[PDB]
C-alpha cells in the first residue's frame, strides 16, 4: 500500500534522526567505557547483577535494523546503559563517574530529539 510506503518513509527519517543523536551521545563517551557489551569472558558474574545489559554497539545494531519505533524505545535502552553502570559500580569508580557525566551530557542531545521528533512528526 501506499501508506505503508509513507509509514516506512517516517520510520527510516526516524532512523536518521536517531543515528544522529546516537553519535552525539557517543561523542561524550570519549573514553570509550559504552562502546561494546560487558565481556562475560571478563566479569562472569554480571548476569547475575544486571538482567538488561546494554551498550552504544548493540544500540547500533537495533537501530540499523530499524528496530526503535520512536524515541521513548531509543532512551530506554541509553538509559539501560547509564543505570546498569551506577548499579554495577561503586560511586568512586571511574565507570560510575564517567556513566553520571554521559547522562548530565546527554541530557541536552535528548532534549532537543525530543522536540525534533514532535516538531517533524
Not at 23 to 43: M, N, T
Not at 91 to 97: E, H, I, K, L, S
Amino acid at each position: 500500500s501506499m501508506e505503508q510506503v509513507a509509514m516506512e518513509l517516517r520510520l527510516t527519517e526516524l532512523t536518521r534522526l536517531l543515528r544522529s543523536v546516537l553519535d552525539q551521545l557517543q561523542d561524550k563517551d570519549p573514553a570509550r567505557i559504552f562502546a561494546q557489551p560487558v565481556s562475560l569472558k571478563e566479569v562472569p558474574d554480571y548476569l547475575d547483577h544486571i538482567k538488561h545489559p546494554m551498550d552504544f554497539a548493540t544500540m547500533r545494531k537495533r537501530l540499523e535494523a530499524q528496530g526503535y519505533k520512536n524515541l521513548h524505545e531509543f532512551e530506554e535502552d541509553f538509559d539501560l546503559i547509564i543505570d546498569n553502570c551506577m548499579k554495577y559500580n561503586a560511586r568512586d569508580t571511574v565507570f560510575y563517574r564517567a556513566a553520571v557525566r554521559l547522562r548530565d551530557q546527554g541530557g541536552v542531545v535528548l532534549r532537543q530529539a525530543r522536540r525534533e521528533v514532535d516538531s517533524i512528526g
